[PDB]
Amino acid sequence: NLNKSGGKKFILELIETVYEEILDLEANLRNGQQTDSTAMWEALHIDDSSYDVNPFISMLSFDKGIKIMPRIFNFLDKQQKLKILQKIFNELSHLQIIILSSYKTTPKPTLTQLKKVDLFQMIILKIIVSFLSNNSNFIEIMGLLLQLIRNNNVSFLTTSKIGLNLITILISRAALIKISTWNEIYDKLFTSLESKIQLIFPPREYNDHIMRLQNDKFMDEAYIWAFLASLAASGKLNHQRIIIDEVRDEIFATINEAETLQKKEKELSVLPQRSQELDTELKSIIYNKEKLYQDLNLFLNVMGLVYRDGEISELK
């Protein structure tokens, strides 16, 4: 709720103040003059514990708040940027974009709501990725993972496209930093997901609704298989056994969809007369068939397995 942070008029006023401070910093920098980002940092209210939901978290409910984020990052130092990430992960379940992108809390998102999710995805996640890839050590990444696991119902976060992608970013980054603290923290994360891994795949009624609004012929589930690939890659054999078991029916459903597309391809390609529209149809079928093969193999290859020649077999 917006009232749990001071109300709509208060948050909209904070955003206007943030824009004024950025415009001043940008003008000073452009004119080759000295810059002081203290007033801008203070206008963000990150260290403000006065409200049930932090004012910065509520500012992220508005497109204007989201759109100024890369410009904000141009004038902050490492610890300030880390404090923002810590805040986001600590209050991730209170983030409106998580509630909007979860099939559980928002089973029928409107097109306007889907546009907000795509915006947050494009701007916010690109910033998190770039910052962690460049300015983060082992202790700091481990810190963010613990912030996520301790302050949120992790299974709820995985019902959200944003939630799932944020977890994938943290796992993938942790895996690149090379008994370890990471082995211990991965296992704590694994515990919060065990017996609930299948819940990352949204219901069909949800997929239909999104497909209708976005003009998608197939629901893009590449981000789900990317998450499963990163989860499997950082796991021991026993973790992998559980993951495969929990998503086995999803592996078979994907294979069936790929095999239906392969049959359609065969049936249409053998037709003697082929107009430009039939060539467009065939190119569309081949594209979607290869996409399913590639998304599934991203996950399978990580465990030394491969889907090839209509079967799952051992790689190398």
Binding site: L237, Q240, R241, R248, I251, M303, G304, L305, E314, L315
Partner: peptide, 13 residues
Amino acid sequence: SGSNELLSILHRK
């Protein structure tokens, strides 16, 4: 050998 074990999990009915 790890791959053989996971392949056996896929064979569960």
